Symmetry: C3
Subunit: 262 residues, 3 copies
C-alpha cells in the first residue's frame, strides 16, 4: 500500500487535491494534513496554478470528519510541521488563490468545516453536511463553531450547531452555504467548470479580492483569531472532561450516553 | 392579580411564561424581575438543560415595552440587575440553550426577545417587527443592531426604517426563525426542539454557545459597542418632543417637529 | 451638462446620474453632482429621504468611467475625496437612501447599491462586480461589502467569477428589497420612501447611526476594509494587467494576463 493521505494532480491551471483514505471514509488524520497542506503551499507558490479544488476519493465520502481512532490515541490531526495551518492542513491555511470544495459525498463534522474553510462549494446531490460533534462530547474545533453562523443565517446556524443534526445538499444550497448541487457523480467536473469561471479572470485582481474580502494581513485572516483563541480555550477544558470519554464509549457500546456535565 | 412571569419545569426544560395577557404580555419591571430571576436560576440548576420563553394565552407572545409604564416614567428592567437589560432577558447571556416559543404577536420588544433567543419557533399567526420608529422611539432592547445580524442587510434595514411587520412565514423563509407550526401547538414544538439539543453533551452545547456568540467572562463582548451607541441615542431621544408626541398619539397621526 | 441632476418629489430628493450616453458611468462630474446633492439633503430639514437613479431606460450605472481610468483621472469629488466613489460610497448621511436601479448596475453601479440603505430594481436590471475581468477590483467598497450583504459563499462566487446576478436572484437572496415592472422603478422607490418618511425623523436617524455603527460621524467599522482596499488598489494599478484588462475590453478581445 503506502499511498499518501492526499494526492495532488494538475488539470491544466487547477490543482486538484484528493483526500485519499476511502477505507476510512476520508477521515482526517496527520497523513491527510501533510498531503493537503503541502499541496496548498505548492499551489500558492506555483504561478502556473490559478485555482485549487479539494475533493474526496471514491463515491461515498468527501470527508466523514476527524478520524475518531486518532482522537482516541490523543493524537494530533494537523500537519505535524505546520500546526498553524490547523485541521487537515487546510482550515487555517489562507492562500491567495481560489479554493473550491468538490463534495462527492458525506461531509460531516470536519468535512463541513473543510467546506466552510473553502471559498466555494459544489456538492453531489447525495452529500450530507452537519456538525455532529456535540453528540460525542467534543465540538467543531476546526472552525465550525464560529464560522457556521458567519455563513448561514444565525438562527439556522445555531440549530445546526446545537442539535448536531445533518443538513441536505439542497438545504445547504438554499441557505447560501454551498454554491451548487449537481447530479450524482459529476462533482469534480462541475467544480473544474466553476474554477474555469474564475481562472479566466485577472490573477492579481482575484488574489487581491480574496485578501480584502477575508481581511487578510500578512497571510492571516485577522477576524478569525478571537474565534480560534476561544475554540482552543474551550477544547482544552472539554478534552479533559469525563463526558468526552463517555461519548465514544457509549457509541461503541451501542447504548445512549449518560452525560454527567463534567 | 398575578406574577409578571411564571417559571415551570417540563422535564429538563424550564418554561418561562410572560404572564400579562390583558396587557398583551408587554414588558414592565414585574416581568423583567420574573424572567431575569428564572433565567439566572436556569443557569445554575444542573437539572435544567434548556430554557423556553413564551407568552400567556393564545393572542400575544409580547406586544413590546409597556408604553403605559413608558409614559409614566417607570423603568422597565430588573431593578437589581440593570445589566440584564430589557425584560431581564436581552443582555442576559446564559450557557444553556434558549428557545422563544412565539405564540402570537411579537412586536418591538417582542421581536427583540426573539432576536435575543438562540432559536425561535412560531405559531403561524405570529407577526414580527420593529415599529418603534412610528412611535418616536427606537428598538433600544437590541433590535437596532441585532436585526441586521440575523436578516440580510437590506431586508433588515427595510424592517428597521419602515416599522412594518414581517409574517411568521416570511421570517422563517429568511431564516430569522427556525420553524412555523400550526395554531396552538408552539409550546409543544419548542419542547420538541429542546429535546433535539438536550440529548447532546451539555458541556459541548455550552461551549459551542460561548464560542458562537464570542463570550469572554460571561459577556458578549462584540455587542458592547451596539449597546453603548443605543444607550447614547436613547438617552438623547427621550428628551425630544417627538418622543412624547409619538406615544400619546389619541389614535391620530403624529406631527413630528424633529425636536 | 452636470454629471447628476437633483429634483424634489415632495419631501424626497431624487438624484439622477446624468451621463446616459456613457451608460451613466462615474467620473468626477458625477461625483460632484451626487456628492453635493447628498450633503444638501443632509442639511435641508424638509428633505426626509433620498432616491438615487440613472437617466434613461438602459443603465443605472455601468461602472467606473473606463476612459477616465485610462487617463488616471480622479473619479471622486475633487473637493471631497473622503466621500469616495461617486461622492456616495463613503458619504454617510442620517436620512434614508434608496437606490432605484433602472437598468444595468455593474461594478461601480452595484457598489452604489451596496452603499444605499435600500434598493428597488427594474426587472431588467443586472448586478455584478466584473472588475476582476478588467484587471482591477471593486475598489468602491464592493470587495468588503459584498459578503456583508449576501451569504459568504454566494458573495465569493460573485466576487471571484465577475459574473452577474439578475434582479430577481438578488431579490431572492435579500441583496435588494424589490423587483418591479419595467419602467416603474422610480415610482416604486418613491412609494418605499413614503413608507419611511411618515415615521419619526429623530428615530429614523438614530436607528441608522446605530445600525451602521456611526461614531463622531465616522462609519468606524468600515475603516479596515477601506484601508486594505486602498493599499491593494494602489499596488494593482501599477501592474501591466490593470492596463491590459481595460485595453482588451476597449479593443473587443480576450485579455492576455501576465500576473504582473
Amino acid at each position: 500500500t503506502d499511498a499518501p493521505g492526499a494526492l495532488a494532480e494538475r488539470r491544466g491551471n487547477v490543482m486538484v487535491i484528493t483526500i485519499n483514505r476511502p477505507e476510512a471514509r476520508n477521515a482526517i488524520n496527520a497523513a491527510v494534513s501533510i498531503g493537503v497542506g503541502d499541496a496548498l503551499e505548492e499551489a500558492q507558490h506555483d504561478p502556473e496554478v490559478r485555482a485549487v479544488v479539494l475533493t474526496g476519493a471514491g463515491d461515498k465520502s468527501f470527508c466523514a470528519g476527524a478520524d475518531l481512532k486518532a482522537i482516541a490515541r490523543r493524537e494530533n490531526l494537523y500537519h505535524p510541521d505546520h500546526p498553524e495551518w490547523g485541521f487537515a492542513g487546510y482550515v487555517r491555511h489562507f492562500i491567495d488563490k481560489p479554493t473550491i470544495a468538490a463534495v462527492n459525498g458525506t461531509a460531516l463534522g470536519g468535512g463541513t468545516e473543510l467546506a466552510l474553510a473553502s471559498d466555494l462549494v459544489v456538492a453531489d446531490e447525495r452529500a450530507q453536511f452537519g456538525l455532529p460533534e456535540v453528540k460525542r462530547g467534543l465540538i467543531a474545533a476546526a472552525g465550525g463553531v464560529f464560522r457556521i453562523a458567519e455563513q448561514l443565517p444565525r438562527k439556522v446556524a445555531m440549530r445546526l450547531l446545537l442539535t448536531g443534526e445533518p443538513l441536505s445538499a439542497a438545504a445547504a444550497r438554499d441557505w447560501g452555504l454551498i454554491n451548487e448541487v449537481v447530479e450524482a457523480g459529476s462533482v469534480l467536473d462541475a467544480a473544474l467548470a466553476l474554477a474555469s469561471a474564475i481562472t479566466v479572470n485577472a490573477p492579481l485582481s482575484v488574489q487581491a479580492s480574496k485578501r480584502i474580502a477575508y481581511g487578510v494581513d500578512d497571510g492571516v485572516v485577522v477576524g478569525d483569531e478571537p474565534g480560534w483563541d476561544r475554540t482552543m480555550r474551550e477544547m482544552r477544558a472539554l478534552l479533559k472532561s469525563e463526558d468526552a470519554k463517555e461519548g465514544p464509549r457509549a457509541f461503541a457500546e451501542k447504548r445512549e450516553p449518560v452525560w454527567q456535565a463534567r
